RNA sequence: CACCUCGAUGUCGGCUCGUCGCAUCCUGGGGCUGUAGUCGGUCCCAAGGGUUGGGCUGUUCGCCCAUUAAAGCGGCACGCGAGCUGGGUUCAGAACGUCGUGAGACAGUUCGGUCCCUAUCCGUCGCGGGCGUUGGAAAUUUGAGAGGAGCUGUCCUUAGUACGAGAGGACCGGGAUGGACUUACCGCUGGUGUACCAGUUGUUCUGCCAAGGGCAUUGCUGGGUAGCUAUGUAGGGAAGGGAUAAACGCUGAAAGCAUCUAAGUGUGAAGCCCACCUCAAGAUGAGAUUUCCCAUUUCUUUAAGAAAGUAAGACCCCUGAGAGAUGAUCAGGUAGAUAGGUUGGAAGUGGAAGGCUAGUGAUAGUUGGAGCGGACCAAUACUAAUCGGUCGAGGACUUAAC
RNA sequence: GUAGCGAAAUUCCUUGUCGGGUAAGUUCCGACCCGCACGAAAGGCGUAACGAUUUGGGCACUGUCUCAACGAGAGACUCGG
RNA sequence: CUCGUUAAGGAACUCGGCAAAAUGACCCCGUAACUUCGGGAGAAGGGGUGCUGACUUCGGUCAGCCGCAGUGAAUAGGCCC
RNA sequence: GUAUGAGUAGCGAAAGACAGGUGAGAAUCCUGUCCACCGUAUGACUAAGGUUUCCUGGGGAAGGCUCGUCCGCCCAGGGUU
RNA sequence: UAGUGAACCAGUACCGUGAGGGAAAGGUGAAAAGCACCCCGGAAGGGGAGUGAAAUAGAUCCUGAAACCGUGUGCCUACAA
C-alpha cells in the first residue's frame, strides 16, 4: 500500500516530488517518519531510472523530478549549472551503479517541538 | 478423520462432464500426532495434532519438550481432534492428505477475515433509513427498545468489531487430493484469509 | 433480474408490444425473476389489431434478459434487452410467432412450444 | 445530554487511573554512555550503531 | 500462486488459437438436448478477455434476429470443441463495451490480415 | 373517577429496531363430524419458526389490484421523535361556506408555515489494563452456564392405485427442485477501485520542436490490479435419541361386570432435553492434561519475614499485516525474507519514446504484443528491524493414606 | 335568488353517483344536481399571456427505492500544544 | 457531513419525484391546441460541431484522417397534457 | 472564589516543501528555491469610518484560539510640508 | 459585600446612537532597612548570603478560614448490589 500523508491525491503527489527532489539535491534531509518512509521508495525509483540512463528513463524521471538547480560551479571561467535531473543521471546513477537497491537510509531522531512529530534523517548511503 | 492445513487460495477446476466448479486449495504438510489423550489421564479421548514446522528460534524450551515425545520439529499450530479411533494413532504418527479421498463430505473450520469496527448495517445486515425526504437517519442501529424496562435488553445488536470468528462450513466436497503436493481441493469457499489455519474433518452430519 | 414495475418487450405477435410486471410468481417474498420465470404483467402498449389488448392482466414467461443466465458448464449468456412471451396457463404462447433469439433455459422449464417457434435458441 | 450528578473526587480519580504518561526505550548509548532512545540517534554524541551521523 | 498454477496447469488447454478482443471467432460449443449431444456454432466478435491461467474467460458478441447476444466462455472449458479465428479486427482497446450501444454499420470493424 | 406529572411526562401516521402474551393466520399432533375420496366444519394440544408488494388516502382503518403455506390478534407511555420524518392535528398570514351589527368565531374547509441538546451515571455493543485463580512459566483443553439456528412451496413416484356410480381422487412411504432467511468467500458474473494504463479539450510552465508537468469535480472520457464487495459463488435449517402435551392404549381393581390408573406398563407434536453452530474456568466452585525452570544470595527471626540477583519465560523498543479507532491479535528482529528497494514475473492497459517508411497533410505501417505497470507472485540482506534494557520462581499449614 | 355556475378554496351525509385515466385512483379530470350552507362590483361566469402559486397525469432521468457496495476529503480515533 | 462511481430494475420511494439525476452553448430544419392576433415559442421533435488538404461566391462545398466520445474540459432551459 | 462535565467540545472555508540563517529555544521568524491559490480580484486607487494601527530600533509579561526569536501587541524615538 | 455609587485619580473604567445605566479596587514593616554579593536559569522564578524582633512580614506583601488542588502515610479495600 501507500500512505496518504494527510493530503489530497494531487497535493500528496506534489509534496513527494518536492521532497524527493530536495533529497536528490542535498543527499540528506530531515522530515517526519511517514514522509520519509514514503520518500524512500519514490527516490529509490528515481535512482533506478538514473541507473538505466537511456532517454526513455530520462523522460520518465523528468515527469517526477522538479526543475531545480542541483548545484552550480564556475568551470572554465564559466558558471555551470546542474539541474536535479542532470545530477541524478550524471552523478547518482553512476554512484549507485553497483548497489541492488536500498540506496537510502533513515535515522530516527528527536520529535519535533511544535508537534512532537517523530523526525528522521533520510540520506543516501 | 481430520487434518490441519493452510488456506492457500481459490481457483476453479473442470470436473468430468466438463462442469466447472470453484475450489479452495488447502495445503496440509503432514501433521504429526503430538499427544494422545484418554479417559484415564485426561477424562476424555482425543489426539493432539501439530502442523506447520516452526523455526527453532521461534519456539520455547517448554514447547520443544512437549514435541520431543513425538520427535519432530516445533509445530506452529496445535489442535485436538475428538471422535477418532485412538487405537489408530500414536505419538509421532503422521497424518497426510491421503487420509481423505475425492468425493468425501467434510466440515471445514476457519477464522473469518477480520473487518474491524463495523456499523450495524454491515455487521448485522440491518436496514438503512431513508436517504432523502428530510431523513437524518441513514446508517443508525434503530431504536434501542421500549420505554417500560428503563433499560436496553441484551442482544440489542450494535456496531462493534466484525469478523475474526470461528466459523464452520458443513458438507463441503473434497474435489481432489494431491499427496505429492499435500493439497486438498475443496469445492466452494471456506472461511479465513490466505495463509490462515484451516481444519478439515469428516462431516458430522454424514 | 426482472422485478415489479419492470417493463419488457414482447417477443411474439400476440398483440401486446410492451408489458409491465405486476408479480414475480414462485414465492411469498420473491423479489426478482430471471429467464424462464413466469410473471403477472399488464399490457402497457399493444398493436392496434392484436388479440391481446392494452390494459389487460396477463401471464408471461421471460425469454431473454440483460442480466442473462449462467450455464452449468461455466459459460454465460447475456442479451441486449428484456423480452417476454405472453402465455396461457398451460405455457402455450398466446401468439403464433416468436421474435428474436431465445435462451435455452426454457427447454428444461418445459416451454417446448415457445422453444420450437423461436427463430433461434441459445 | 448533561451530567445528572457532579462527579465525586473518588470517581474522578478512578477514571484518571489510566490517564498517565510513560517513558520507554531508554538505555545507555554505546558511544558516550548517555541514556538514549533505542533505535534512535543519540542526541548527545550524534552516534548510532557506533558511528557518527 | 505458484502452487495454484501447478495444480491447474494440467487442465489448461493447448490448442487455443492466438486471438485478441476485436477478432471475429467461431466457437464450436457443445450442447446437449437430452441424450443427444451437438455442436452449435456461435460466431461473433470477441468483446472481452479477462482473467489468468485456468480462470481466463472471453466474451463473444453477435446480433442474431436483430437482438444483441453475448456468450462468455472459460478459455479452457472442454465443452468448447474448437475456437476458430474467422477474422482479425483493428481495435484500440482491450474491452469493446462501446459496441453494445452501436448497431449495424456503426459497429463494423476493419480487418487487418495479421 | 381525578390519584403522579401544568418551576413541561411531546401528541396521530410512517421509518429503524425489535421484544413479549396466546384467546393460533400458516406449518406440527389429535378427538368428533350431518368425516366415502379431494375438500372441509368444530373442538383439543401447540408460541419453534414464518406470517407481502402495490393503487387511493396524512392517515390508522378500509376498499381495490396481484400474490402467499399464511397474509393472526394484542401488550410493551395506543413500544420506539436526547433514534429519524413531520404529511394530519394546536400559533402568527390569506381565502371559501356559515354564525355575528362588530371585533371575530367554527356548528366546517383550503393554500403556507423554525422538530434544539458535545452522553455524567445505569443500560446495550465491542476492546484493553489490574489483580486473582496460592512456586514461576508455554501450550492444549473438559464444559457449569449462555447465545445462535428452528420456516416453507411446487413437482415426480407410489397410483390414476385406496375411495367413489361418476366426476374426481388420496393417507402412509421414497425422491427432485425452489422461495424467504442465513454463515462464509472473491475462483466465476458484475460493482468499486483519487500514487494502474490509455484517449482528449482549454490554458499555462519545463527557452523552442518533440516529449512532458500544473490546474480545470480524479478536468473529462474508455478500461482496470489488490482490497472491500452482491445482485455473484458455496454451504445451512439432515437424519436421530430422551421425557412429555392433547390423544390413544395394554393389563388392572376399587365396584365379580365395566374401566387408559390407583399400583403396573406403552405409543404420541415444527413444541421441552439432547442432537447441529458459536462463546465459555473471574464456573472467586477460578477445573484438567503435556511440557519447561530449580531450590540461589543477603539481613532480619522463626517471620506464608524483607530485598536482590537471576533461571524457564514475557515485555519494552524496532520491521510489519492475514490484524487494527487506540490497546489488543498475529508475522519478524541478521539464529532474518518482517517491510522498503532491486531483479524476474503476473494482472491491467493496449502498441511507449527515438527512429525509419508511405503520404502534400492530418495520419498510418514498422522497429515491437511494445512501453508503462499501487496493493499480487517469486527470489535477493542492498536499506531498516543495531546496541540494548526491564520484569520474571526457590514454592504455607492440617490430616488421611504410603 | 334571475342569468350564470354547482360534491366547488363552498357538499356535512361523502370515498355521493356515473364516465375517463391506473392492474388497482378517498386525490385528479368530465358529467349529474336534494346547492347541509353558490350567485351577480364584500361582483357571477369565462379568459390568451404570466406564476420559485396549489393540484393530477405522461416522457426523460436517475441510489428516491428493491438493497445496498466501493472510493475521496473534513471531523471523529492516537500523539504534542 | 461534503463529494465521485454503480450490476439489473427505473418512482416500486415518499404526504409529495424532496433530493439527486437528466436538459443546457452555438448553427440548421421544424414547431401544435388556443389567442386579446402581440403571443403560445427557445413549444415539441430532430440534425451538425474535431483535425488535414483542395475549392470557394469566403458560408460553404468536396475529399481525406483520428477517437468510445469533436460547444472532447468549465460555464449555459428538462419537456408535455 | 472554586469545582463538575474534562484534559472532553472547539482551536473559525484553502498547499505547502526542504536548505540555510537567527536564536536559550523554531512546523509557526528571516532568506532562498520549487510548488500551489486569487487575478471584474484575494490586484491598483479612493470616499466614509477608524484615529497612530504608519516608519525605525528594541521586547516576549499579557493579547495572538498552538508556537513565536514574530505582530495591527508592549517599550523608545520618529513621521503628515 | 458595611458606610456616599465612589475611603483608592468615580460618576472614572465599561455599556448604549442617545437620553441613560454604572463597577471593581484600602492594610509590607517601627523604620525600606524594599534582599549588596554568589549559584541554577535566556528570563521569570528560585537556593544561599544579607536587612529585620519577625521574610511562612519580599511588595499577588498584617491576620490567612472554607470550598478546591496536591505530597507523605497509620489502617482498609479487586465475589462486591
Ligand atoms: K402538565
Ligand atoms: K380436525
Ligand atoms: K409459534
Ligand atoms: K401509500
Ligand atoms: K408487536
Ligand atoms: K424530534
Ligand atoms: K427521553
Ligand atoms: K444513574
Ligand atoms: K498541457
Ligand atoms: K499553476
Ligand atoms: K470498473
Ligand atoms: K483458571
Ligand atoms: K514508437
Ligand atoms: K503487456
Ligand atoms: K354539485
Ligand atoms: K356551501
Ligand atoms: K373509474
Ligand atoms: K396555472
Ligand atoms: K408564484
Ligand atoms: K450516490
Ligand atoms: K423498490
Ligand atoms: K398518498
Ligand atoms: K407549451
Ligand atoms: K462523430
Ligand atoms: K439555457
Ligand atoms: K468551570
Ligand atoms: K474538570
Ligand atoms: K521584534
Ligand atoms: K507576618
Ligand atoms: K490522604
Ligand atoms: Mg486536480
Ligand atoms: Mg525543494
Ligand atoms: Mg428496505
Ligand atoms: Mg428495572
Ligand atoms: Mg488479459
Ligand atoms: Mg376527591
Ligand atoms: Mg422539573
Ligand atoms: Mg392454547
Ligand atoms: Mg406511542
Ligand atoms: Mg425517546
Ligand atoms: Mg352578516
Ligand atoms: Mg369543532
Ligand atoms: Mg412555499
Ligand atoms: Mg469477485
Ligand atoms: Mg482476484
Ligand atoms: Mg509541442
Ligand atoms: Mg488558478
Ligand atoms: Mg514473502
Ligand atoms: Mg369526485
Ligand atoms: Mg402513479
Ligand atoms: Mg371511478
Ligand atoms: Mg360569496
Ligand atoms: Mg353585492
Ligand atoms: Mg374577484
Ligand atoms: Mg490532545
Ligand atoms: Mg444503477
Ligand atoms: Mg446501468
Ligand atoms: Mg407509490
Ligand atoms: Mg409504499
Ligand atoms: Mg427537485
Ligand atoms: Mg461541456
Ligand atoms: Mg465525555
Ligand atoms: Mg484557522
Ligand atoms: Mg468571475
Ligand atoms: Mg508595523
Ligand atoms: Mg518593529
Ligand atoms: Mg501563546
Ligand atoms: Mg458599590
Ligand atoms: Mg506565619
Ligand atoms: Mg499574608
Ligand atoms: Mg460468587
Ligand atoms: Mg475480597
Ligand atoms: Zn551517545
Place of cell 445488536: B157
- How far is E81 from E66, CA to CA, in rounded Å? 27
C49/B contact by beta carbon, under 8 A: no
* Cα B14 to middle of ligand 53, angstroms: 94
The distance (Å) linking the CA of E70 with the C1' of F231 is 19
Q: List the alpha helices (DSSP H) in B4-124.
A: 61-68, 120-124
**CA E55/CA E47 separation, integer angstroms:** 17
Integer Cα distance of B87 and B136 in angstroms: 65
B182: nearest Cα among B125, B121, B106, B100: B100
Any residues with CB less than 8 A from the CB of A121 and at least 6 apart, and which?
A: A28, A29, A30, A106, A107, A109, D41, D53
Neighbours of ion ligand 73 (CB under 5 A): D 29, 31-32, 34, 42, 44-45
> What approach was used to elucidate this structure?
cryo-EM
Alpha-carbon dihedral of residues B108, B113, B119, B123, nearest 10 degrees? -10
Location of C-alpha cell 392484436 = C50
A42 contact partners, CB below 8 Å, separation of at least 6 = A16, A20, A64
Find, in chain D, the residue whose alpha carbon is nearest to that of A28: D53
Q: H or E element: which one contains A49? A: helix A33-52
Query: Do C59 and C92 meet the contact criterion of CB atoms below 8 Å apart?
Result: no
| Contact (Cβ atoms closer than 8 angstroms) between residue B22 and residue B188 | yes
The phi and psi torsions of A63 (rounded to 5 degrees) equal -65, -20
Note the helical H segments in E10-95.
none
Rounded Cα distance between C88 and A103, Å, is 78
- Nearest one of C95, C26, C104, C38 to C69, comparing CA atoms: C104
* Cβ pair B112, B123 in contact under 8 A: no
Resolution to 1 decimal place, in Å: 3.0
Q: Is the CB of D18 under 7 A from strand J?
A: no
Please list, residue by residue across B48-72, b when 16 or more beta carbons sit within 10 angstroms of its beta carbon and e when fewer do.
bbbbbebeeeebeeebeebbeebeb
Helices A33-52 and A55-62 pack at an angle, to 10 degrees, of 150
> Does A68 count as an annotated binding residue?
yes
Residue nearest to nucleotide I15 (CA to C1'): A11
Q: Which grid cell is C39?
A: 410473471
Residues of C in contact with B19 (CB under 8 A): 72-74
Going by C-alpha positions, the residue among B39, B30, B21 that lies closest to residue B3 is B30
* CB of E31 closer than 8 Å to CB of C120: no
CA dihedral sign of residues E70, E71, E72, E75: negative
Cβ distance C27 to C39 under 8 Å? no
Query: What is the rounded distance in angstroms from the CA atom of residue C107 to the CA atom of residue C85?
Result: 14
The HSE-up count of residue B10 (CA atoms within 13 Å, CB side) is: 9
Task: At A64, list the grid cell.
Answer: 517526477
Give the distance, in angstroms, between residue B187 CA and nucleotide F337 C1': 33
Q: For C1-118, where are the E strands, in sequence order?
A: 7-10, 16-24, 38-46, 57-64, 69-70, 76-79, 83-87
CA B135 to chain CA centroid, nearest Å: 42
Amino acid at each position: 500500500s501507500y500512505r496518504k500523508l494527510g493530503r489530497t491525491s494531487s497535493q500528496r503527489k506534489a509534496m513527494l516530488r518536492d521532497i524527493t527532489t530536495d533529497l536528490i539535491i542535498n543527499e540528506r534531509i530531515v522530515t517526519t517518519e511517514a514522509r520519509a518512509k514514503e520518500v524512500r521508495s519514490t527516490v529509490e525509483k528515481m535512482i533506478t531510472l538514473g541507473k538505466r540512463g537511456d532517454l526513455h528513463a530520462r523522460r520518465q524521471a523528468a515527469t517526477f523530478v522538479r526543475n531545480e538547480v542541483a548545484s552550480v560551479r564556475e568551470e572554465d571561467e564559466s558558471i555551470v549549472v546542474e539541474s536535479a535531473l542532470q545530477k541524478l543521471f550524471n552523478d547518482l546513477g553512476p554512484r549507485f551503479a553497483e548497489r541492488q537497491g536500498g540506496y537510502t537510509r533513515i535515522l530516527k531522531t528527536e520529535p519535533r517541538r511544535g508537534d512532537a512529530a517523530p523526525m528522521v534523517v533520510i540520506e543516501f548511503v | 478423520k481430520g487434518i490441519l492445513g493452510k488456506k492457500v487460495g481459490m481457483t476453479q477446476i473442470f470436473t468430468e462432464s466438463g462442469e466447472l466448479i470453484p475450489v479452495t486449495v488447502v495445503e496440509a504438510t503432514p501433521n504429526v500426532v503430538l499427544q494422545v489423550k484418554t479417559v484415564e489421564t485426561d477424562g476424555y479421548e482425543a489426539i493432539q495434532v501439530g502442523y506447520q514446522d516452526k523455526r527453532e528460534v521461534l519456539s520455547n524450551k517448554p514447547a520443544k519438550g512437549h514435541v520431543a515425545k513425538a520427535n519432530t520439529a516445533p509445530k506452529r499450530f496445535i489442535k485436538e481432534f475428538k471422535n477418532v479411533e485412538l487405537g489408530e494413532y500414536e505419538v509421532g504418527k503422521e497424518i497426510k492428505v491421503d487420509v481423505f479421498q475425492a468425493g468425501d463430505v467434510v466440515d471445514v473450520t476457519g477464522t473469518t477475515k477480520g473487518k474491524g469496527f463495523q456499523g450495524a448495517i454491515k455487521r448485522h445486515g440491518q436496514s438503512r433509513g431513508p436517504m432523502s425526504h428530510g431523513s437524518r437517519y441513514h446508517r443508525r442501529p434503530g431504536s434501542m427498545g421500549p420505554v417500560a424496562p428503563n433499560r436496553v435488553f441484551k442482544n440489542k445488536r450494535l456496531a462493534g468489531r466484525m469478523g475474526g470468528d470461528r466459523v464452520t462450513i458443513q458438507n463441503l466436497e473434497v474435489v481432489k487430493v494431491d499427496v505429492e503436493r499435500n493439497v486438498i481441493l475443496i469445492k466452494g469457499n471456506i472461511p479465513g484469509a490466505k495463509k490462515s489455519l484451516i481444519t478439515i474433518k469428516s462431516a458430522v452430519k454424514a | 433480474m426482472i422485478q415489479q414495475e419492470s417493463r419488457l418487450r414482447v417477443a411474439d405477435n400476440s398483440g401486446a408490444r410492451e408489458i409491465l410486471t405486476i408479480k414475480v410468481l414462485g414465492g411469498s417474498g420473491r423479489k426478482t425473476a430471471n429467464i424462464g420465470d413466469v410473471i403477472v404483467a399488464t399490457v402497457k402498449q399493444a398493436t392496434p389489431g392484436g388479440v391481446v389488448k392494452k390494459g389487460e392482466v396477463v401471464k408471461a414467461v421471460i425469454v431473454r434478459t440483460k442480466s442473462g443466465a449462467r450455464r452449468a458448464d461455466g459459460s454465460y449468456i447475456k442479451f441486449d434487452e428484456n423480452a417476454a412471451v405472453i402465455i396461457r396457463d398451460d405455457k402455450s404462447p398466446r401468439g403464433t410467432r416468436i421474435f428474436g433469439p431465445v435462451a435455452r433455459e426454457l427447454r428444461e422449464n418445459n416451454f417446448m412450444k415457445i422453444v420450437s417457434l423461436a427463430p433461434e435458441v441459445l | 445530554a448533561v451530567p445528572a450528578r457532579r462527579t465525586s473526587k473518588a470517581k474522578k480519580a478512578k477514571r484518571r487511573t489510566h490517564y498517565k504518561l510513560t517513558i520507554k526505550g531508554l538505555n545507555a548509548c554505546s558511544n558516550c554512555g548517555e541514556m538514549k532512545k533505542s533505535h534512535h540517534v543519540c542526541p548527545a554524541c550524534g552516534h548510532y550503531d557506533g558511528k557518527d551521523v | 500462486n505458484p502452487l495454484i498454477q501447478e495444480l491447474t496447469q494440467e487442465q489448461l488447454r493447448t490448442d487455443i488459437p492466438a486471438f485478441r478482443p476485436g477478432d471475429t471467432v467461431r466457437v464450436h460449443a457443445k450442447v446437449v438436448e437430452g441424450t443427444r449431444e451437438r455442436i452449435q456454432l456461435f460466431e461473433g466478435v470477441v468483446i472481452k478477455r479477462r482473467g489468468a491461467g485456468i480462470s481466463e474467460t472471453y466474451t463473444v458478441r453477435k446480433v442474431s434476429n436483430g437482438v444483441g447476444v453475448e456468450r462468455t466462455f472459460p478459455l479452457h472449458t472442454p465443452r468448447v470443441a474448437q475456437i476458430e479465428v474467422v477474422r482479425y479486427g483493428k481495435v484500440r482497446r482491450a474491452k469493446l463495451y462501446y459496441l453494445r450501444a452501436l448497431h449495424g454499420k456503426a459497429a463494423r470493424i476493419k480487418e487487418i490480415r495479421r
